[PDB]
């Protein structure tokens, strides 16, 4: 109930919600049924249009107006836009040259450049190309400021999480906006995109950017726009609150567009009928842009153009139906559509099985257009995991696919040619940004990044300090002219041993053999010179991964490898090796197939043994220095070391040889050398971060040796490849993957196949970020380049997605 017997007289739009209870006027009354019974009336005219015509020119003020042509509307702050085009000869913003923007030039009692966010709806990021010319003023903007050549989105690409991640710098699984349809099994609560719940504060966690900016005194216009109220009107409105006093006067402002994305579900990203609304964003984009002009704040504000997700072609036809796999299919609740999330319909049922549904969706048809994975088991890349809101079973669907649970679904719910929730790799899923301004770079193009770093520099534009976020921190400082925030790498928290030969062969029980009792100072001291690290410089290349945690770890240097040998979970926490273009692949020599050597550096008692290896009936092991890439038949010994070994699933171990033995030399050849770390990760609560010890969930069989949940593998080269990998005058090039340790290749359904036709397949789906791999290591990579820090920071984020070009 609200009582709306009050007015909206002067209060249009007002920047505060009143006090309860009372009659309201700002942008979410519609959304609330609370609008004063005026509202419509006072603040939502449409009188005479949105443009001055050259009769209206120096009119007497009539207040029933849209806007005014009036000799005062300038004082008032409520001009149409055009209003000095039209009389008083000036030019349109798009029509004069870019002149580069040195220094804000603002009006007096601006304390600081404002930030205008132009958030664009299903703005697919080749529309900067294929709608070129239909959009002019986007394109200056594109131009003349800094841009580039597409926005990675989140996971989904649904609306909702995306525009709050932009918000917030936090992955959905963090906020809590989870999809476009959630489910909270806490508060037994649904939240729908039609109705009254999503507003409830519950659903939305973290801290969004109006939030920061308040509690630091910096005032916000609203966020939100209700649907019935014009793009004129919206911009008129931030034009009108750019003119309020100075202790009123918002400093961030945004603006939302429903197009291009509405118009792309009807007609698909490129029907012919997507045109009209990429002219009419341009026109909008045009008023505000001139509106800025009268108001001499053109050269003075920060623009910020941004999608939230691209849009695909998806049509009825294309809908993949659970009842064609499970007999069961009234039994599952499904969040349907380019994604797929399944829960029991009744929690009282204990008939239910995750697994006989995951078998029942794995591999059944031939071209099956969806594939079911158990949450953790998602590619890490997508942070899709770690809330009570995400369903345990999960269908990623392919591109111009849906999914739905039976075909009544679909005919009593073709309406649709295009949607958007695809995984965020997914090239129509790109979306777009441009920053204009004077704290924006002039006519610069910057590499894609993703959205979640966004949330930092907007803080950054407006002098804030950013709540804590998933950006990484002046990883986009290269986007600005000044404002950039100077991070300094972090301190290391554990400082490693060094340990000499202190232990003799017989000290160790660990039911290992090796044929290596195979016999000169010459090739006796350059084996001394190998373990004190003599070729070091080599296989380490960036410096030592800094351990930014409290644990017990040793390095220990070989002739090909060098590595960071943890004594709490008895292997390497990382492995570092360069293996350059001429480098030769041999294979394992029939006599050392087996073999695993004592390391006469490390105890007996922080080692691992074969007999758990033995006595675990799945569990094998794998190496993370590949004996393969020895560099002499004497090195080779040192790749069956005790302290190089690590746990392996007979499965896995297919993805991780085929790796080692073949991929790895091919990457040397394309990249002209390349380095390598390689180690385990574990993550068993999913979280995306470091378990600590307490968290381990499987061990080999009757040891203390934990089971990673993956293993990741960094890979760098030369940006230049004419450059060696291991002599690199400048930038690099790095990918990375986090493979998940699986004992059965259920994902990959061409596995009983030669590695050579879906190993890589695999390896490319779980692409990742160094930065992924450091959450999830408590480690700190490139700590010793001839780099700029924010250059290796924007390298961190770098993701390898092996999609074709844009
Ligand atoms: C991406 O960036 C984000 C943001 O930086 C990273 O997320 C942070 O990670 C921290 C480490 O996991 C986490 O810190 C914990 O906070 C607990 C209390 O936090 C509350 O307050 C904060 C601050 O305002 C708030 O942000 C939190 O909001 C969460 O919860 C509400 C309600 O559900 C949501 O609205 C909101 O969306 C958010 O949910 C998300 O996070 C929670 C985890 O907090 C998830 O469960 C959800 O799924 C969702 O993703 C909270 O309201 C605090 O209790 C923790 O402290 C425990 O552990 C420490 C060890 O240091 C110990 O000292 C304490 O005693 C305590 O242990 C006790 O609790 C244990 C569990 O109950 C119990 O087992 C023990 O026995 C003890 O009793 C902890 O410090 C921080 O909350 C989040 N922040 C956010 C916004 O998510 C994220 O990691 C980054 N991701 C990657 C991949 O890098
Ligand atoms: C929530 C955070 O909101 C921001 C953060 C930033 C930032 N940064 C900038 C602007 C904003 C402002 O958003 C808004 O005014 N809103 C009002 C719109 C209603 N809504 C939908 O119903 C919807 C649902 C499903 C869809 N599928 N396809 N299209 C869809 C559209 C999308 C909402 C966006
Ligand atoms: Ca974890
Ligand atoms: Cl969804
Ligand atoms: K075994
Ligand atoms: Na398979
Ligand atoms: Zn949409």
Redesign the pocket.
Known sequence: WTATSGSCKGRCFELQEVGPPDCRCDNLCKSYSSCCHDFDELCLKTARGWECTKDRCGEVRNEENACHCSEDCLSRGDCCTNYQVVCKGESHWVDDDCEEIKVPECPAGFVRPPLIIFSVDGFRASYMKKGSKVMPNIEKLRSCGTHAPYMRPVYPTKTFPNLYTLATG??P????IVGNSMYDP?FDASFHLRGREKFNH?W????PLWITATKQGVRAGTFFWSVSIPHERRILTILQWLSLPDNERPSVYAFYSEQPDFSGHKYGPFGPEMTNPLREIDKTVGQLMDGLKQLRLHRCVNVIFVGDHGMEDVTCDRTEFLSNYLTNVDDITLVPGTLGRIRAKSINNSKYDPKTIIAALTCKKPDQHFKPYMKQHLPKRL?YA???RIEDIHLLVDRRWHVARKPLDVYKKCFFQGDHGFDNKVNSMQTVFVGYGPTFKYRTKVPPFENIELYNVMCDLLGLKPA???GTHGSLNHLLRTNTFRPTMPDEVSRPNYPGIMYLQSEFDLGCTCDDKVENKLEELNKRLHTKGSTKERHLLYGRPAVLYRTSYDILYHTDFESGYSEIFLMPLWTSYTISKQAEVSSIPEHLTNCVRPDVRVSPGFSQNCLAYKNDKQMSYGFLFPPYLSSSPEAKYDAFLVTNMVPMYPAFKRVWAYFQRVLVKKYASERNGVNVISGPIFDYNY???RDTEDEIKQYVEGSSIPVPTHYYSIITSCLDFTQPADKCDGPLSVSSFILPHRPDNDESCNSSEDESKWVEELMKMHTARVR?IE?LTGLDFYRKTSRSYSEILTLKTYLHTYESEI
């Open positions: 936090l992955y699984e963090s906020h809590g806490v519950r939305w966690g973290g801290q942070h770690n809330n009570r804590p976020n998933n979280d995306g971060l992924d959450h």
